[PDB]
Write a protein that binds this ligand. Structure first.
Ligand SMILES: [Fe+2]
Length: 187
């Protein structure tokens, strides 16, 4: 496995692996995982908020992907969401996230069904797309933060959030807390 020694190495490699038309999912996953999280390299992007997690743009991958860092305060979690027909890679940089995988709802209304539950380990890279299922991720800790590196290809700025009680869904426009280490207007 090609082991990037720095976040910068990993980004350069990513530009090669997404330069073409095909993407070897397991090759990407292994290389993201092989990178050893180093907070000196990504602390400029780790910008937290009191009440909810934040999305922090790192690189735009020449239109081919979004690379961003997500900052999970104590107890912070996401809704149940889809990924708008893209590849989605999630690598742990600090702390631990619990991923819960959900089946897709019918037209009927009722409780949503869990298909899988796991804790992502240190430096682990997970993979999901809409054919794998829906998921929710959350910080397992109420005393420590979590930080994750996400890659979305193609990039997207809208998804759906699902009500666990009924399976009903709403369209959600995602926003960035910061881009390239610079804070965006209005949190
Ligand atoms: Fe997700």
């Amino acid at each position: 496995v090609l082991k990037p020694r720095t976040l910068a190495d990993l980004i350069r490699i990513l530009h090669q692996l997404f330069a073409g038309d095909e993407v070897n999912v397991e090759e990407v996953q292994a290389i993201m995982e092989a990178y050893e999280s180093d907070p000196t390299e990504w602390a400029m992007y780790a910008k937290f908020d009191q009440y909810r997690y934040t999305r922090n743009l790192v690189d735009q991958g020449n239109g081919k992907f979004n690379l961003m860092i997500l900052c999970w305060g104590e107890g912070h979690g996401s809704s149940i969401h889809d990924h708008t027909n893209s590849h989605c890679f999630l690598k742990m940089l600090q702390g631990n996230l619990k991923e819960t995988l959900f089946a897709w709802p019918d037209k009927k209304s009722n409780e949503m069904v869990k298909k899988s539950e796991r804790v992502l380990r240190e430096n682990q890279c997970a993979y999901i797309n809409d054919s794998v299922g829906l998921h929710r991720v959350e910080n397992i800790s109420h005393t420590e933060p979590a930080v994750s590196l996400h890659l979305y290809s193609p990039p997207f700025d809208t998804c759906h959030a699902f009500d666990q009680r009924t399976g009903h869904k709403n369209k959600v426009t995602m926003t960035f807390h910061s881009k390239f280490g610079i804070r965006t207007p209005n949190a």
